[PDB]
Amino acid sequence: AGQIQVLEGLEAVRKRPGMYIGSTSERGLHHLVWEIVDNSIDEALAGYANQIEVVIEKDNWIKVTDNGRGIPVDIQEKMGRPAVEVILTSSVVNALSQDLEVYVHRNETIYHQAYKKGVPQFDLKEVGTTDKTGTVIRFKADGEIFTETTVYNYETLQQRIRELAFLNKGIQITLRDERDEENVREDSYHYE
Template sequence: MIAALHGRKQTMPDITDKITQEYDASQIQVLEGLEAVRKRPGMYIGSTSSSGLHHLVYEIVDNSIDEALAGYCSHIELTIEPGDIICVSDNGRGIPVDIQPQTGKSALEVVFTVLHAGGKFGGGGYKVSGGLHGVGASVVNALSEWLEVNVHKNGKIYQMKFSRGDITQPMTVVGETDHTGTTVRFKPDPIMFEDTVYDYETLHVRM
């Protein structure tokens, strides 16, 4: 399944005067550590049934939509790959890769390993959509058998890999690029969910 968002920037109201700050690690605020997600997943995604499974996708897609609403992203692509693997790609600014001051770690690592870490919570970066209630990419990471993220930023491709929330490959430069954006691929953990088969219509309606 492929769903694409084209020209979203043209349909959005002119809010460039509201969001002018650079999107870097200083805009990522840490509000709470990532704890007990695998032990009590229902607290974070509602349930481990089909609704919780699909909620994982919404969390990642909503991050891309935030970039679109802020005027920095015009294309979002969601793909269901064989084996119930989800791939979400956008042409936004790319998740920050510099050091996040509060933790001393790369912002990319913080976003995927710390609960409720994101630019939506502070006054900088972006704070546009209604996604404040979201649990964040870290919960998706914690509840995935594996997750990998590639960030195109600063002329380089940065990659990190995880397994059930643990880092298996630290942030590594794996290539060069002439554009910006973020691609997240993950496989939900069958240990955590009653079923890991995604429903096309459920995702299509939500998109």
């Protein structure tokens, strides 16, 4: 029933990414991180998260982790599908990613799903157990969309992360660049 409105949202985002993110250039690539990080910052504003970690991984995957509630997994009556899957299939970031993965820690369970260009590659599954709550999102910007550059710039991430931790007092926000195994760089911000 409601599966059809989700697929027009993806085509739209992907024909006119600019309308959603400003550009398909370097600046838009970095907007993808800001979208995901803002969700984690809302977990902390809600009172649940206090730590957010942003990692630039090998082959320019971005990994964002928070220790908030974990995205819900309960079945939605209208879609018939887990809440996380609904949430992530209307995500601009996901649409503009050749690959995206989620891990949710919730209900003493670790759940996993992956997507390409916004489309679920398999059903939500329980892959492990946990005594923490939170959410991990890893995504790789789509080279068929980001046809100029899919390489992140550390100082641009660093700059904004620091401003965000300064604005949002009490949240520990860490940035790490792991792309060169031989020289890993980390900056961790925590105000008050």
